Structure formats: C-alpha cells, structure tokens
Design a protein around this ligand. Structure first.
Ligand code: L1S
Ligand SMILES: OC[C@H]1O[C@@](CO)(O[C@H]2O[C@H](CO)[C@@H](O)[C@H](O)[C@H]2O)[C@@H](O)[C@@H]1O
Length: 241
C-alpha cells in the first residue's frame, strides 16, 4: 500500500531495479512530484527536448514519458550563495540509470582530488549540455531497454571561462565561476526564455560562428557542487532508427 503516484512508484522501481517502494523512496532524501502533462512547465520542457536534438545524434529520437519536479534535501539551502549570481541556466545532465540512486541521495559530485585527469576534457568538475541529445548519450541507453533518465539543473555559471580546446585542469582564474566549451552549434539565442529567473536555451540549433573549436556542441562545467540545483528529472523513451 504505497501512497506514491504510479509514475513515482515506476521511477523508484527503475532506480533500485528489495525493500518496500516507500522505504526506497525515503533513501533518495528527495521530494519527487509529477509535473502535469498539460502544464506550462511540461510544454517548456517538451520544447527544450524537441528543439535541441543534435543533427549528428540521429541513432535515436527522444519522447518524454514522465517529467518529475525534484527537491533534494538541503540542496536549495546549499545553493543560496549562487541564487542571484548573473547567468543561471537550465541545462541537461544525463547519466546511467544505475547511477540515479546515488545522484538523488548525494547530488552531482566531483571526482576526488586523487583521481587522474585522463579523459576529463575540462578537468574534474560537473558537466552539462544545452543540447538534450549530447546529455542523452551519457545515459548509455541500449536498444534492449530503451528508457533513460536525464536531469535538468539550474547551474550558476556566473563569469564563464570560454574555451575552444581541452584543458584537463580543475582550477579557474580569479573571478571565473565556470567553463563554457564553445561548440560549432548553439541553441538560437533569440528563442532563449526565462523560467523562474533562469535562462532556458530551448532555441533550435544554429551555427555559433566560432571557428577552430574541437566541440560540435557547447558544454558547461562547474567546480563546486553548490553551483547546481537539480530541478527536473525526465524519463525518456529512446526510439532507435
Ligand atoms: C584508461 O585511461 C583512459 O584512456 C581514460 C579515458 N577516459 C576516462 N574517463 C572519461 C571521462 N571521465 C568521466 O567520468 C566523465 C564522464 C562524463 C563526462 C561528461 N561530459 C559531458 C558533457 C556534456 C554533458 C554531460 C552529461 N553527463 O550530460 C557530460 N558528461 C565527462 C567526464 C573519467 C573517466 N578515463 C580513462
Ligand atoms: O564560487 C564557487 C566556486 O567557484 C570557484 C571556481 O571554481 O571560485 C570562484 O568563486 C569564488 C567565490 O565566489 C571566488 O573567490 C573565485 O575568485 C572564483 O574563481 C571555486 O573556488 C568556488 O568553490
């Protein structure tokens, strides 16, 4: 007899793959609410998904199954220093389903100091995209179980260190709060809207006019866990072609 709505129950079953559903819910230390399918929030999120699928990520199309509003215990209190920092953006973060119990209970985390920098294009930090398909690739979704989880997070970017090439270090110059990896393609900035004082870059991909960058698409990195406030969790269907 769980009192949770069916979509939340199915999300819990997916994350934990056991204890009663309500016992597993309490382990996430996260308020989870279903966003109404006919709400303005849902419409904005579906537009963000539709508009920001990269043309080079054509292995699958995405369909939104369920949208959840999430509030991790203590996370808004932790974010207070960054809350009116200029340049807050609603950005994607994808991950394996098997990581989501950890992400909801502990939040997005940075690799420990001992960890090697190998493969971290912009060093040990928390990585986000403005193109849903770039983040969806980090779900590692299989044809055999074509359902993935992706976050939308409010990221306090402040003053961005704009880079066109990999730098494997995690230390920013004084007064810089984030790295923007400059892609060849960017959501049309003339379609950017604000949702609760946060920029949502849900424009269709156009050419950035940046030349001599190694990135097809933007990415955004912060180096302090307190610069992230997770807002939504989407369950997506991957329709492979
Ligand atoms: C064996 O040595 C190697 O050759 C080697 C090579 N690579 C490695 N490693 C590869 C990099 N390592 C990471 O954990 C790591 C994982 C994910 C990203 C990442 N980038 C994103 C950009 C936009 C959005 C998202 C998103 N999730 O929405 C992004 N996520 C970045 C880094 C560490 C492990 N380790 C070792
Ligand atoms: O501020 C949060 C976070 O940003 C870093 C850079 O990753 O430092 C920036 O912000 C500091 C406090 O506002 C400034 O003192 C600093 O100049 C600036 O680079 C991290 O050190 C910090 O945890």
């Amino acid at each position: 007899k769980s009192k949770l709505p069916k979509p939340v129950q199915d999300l819990i079953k997916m994350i934990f793959g056991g204890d009663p559903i309500d016992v597993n819910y309490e382990k996430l230390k996260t308020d989870i609410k279903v966003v109404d399918r006919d709400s303005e929030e849902a419409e904005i999120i579906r537009k963000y998904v539709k508009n920001t699928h990269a043309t080079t990520h054509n292995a699958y199309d995405l369909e939104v199954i369920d949208i959840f509003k999430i509030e991790r215990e203590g996370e808004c209190q932790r974010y207070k220093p960054f809350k009116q920092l200029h340049n807050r953006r609603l950005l994607w973060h994808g991950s394996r389903t098997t990581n989501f119990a950890g992400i909801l209970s502990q939040g997005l985390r940075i690799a420990p100091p001992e960890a090697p920098v190998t493969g971290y294009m912009f060093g040990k930090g928390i990585y986000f995209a403005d193109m849903v398909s770039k983040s969806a690739n980090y779900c590692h979704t299989s044809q055999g179980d074509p359902i993935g989880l992706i976050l939308l997070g409010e990221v306090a970017l402040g003053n961005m260190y704009e880079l066109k090439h990999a730098s494997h270090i995690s230390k920013l110059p004084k007064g810089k709060h984030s790295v923007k990896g400059l892609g060849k393609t960017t959501p049309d900035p003339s379609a950017n809207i604000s949702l609760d004082g946060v920029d949502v870059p849900l424009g269709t991909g156009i050419s950035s006019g940046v030349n001599d960058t190694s990135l097809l698409y933007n990415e955004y990195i912060v180096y302090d866990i307190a610069q992230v406030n997770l807002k939504y969790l989407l369950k997506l269907k991957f329709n492979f072609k």
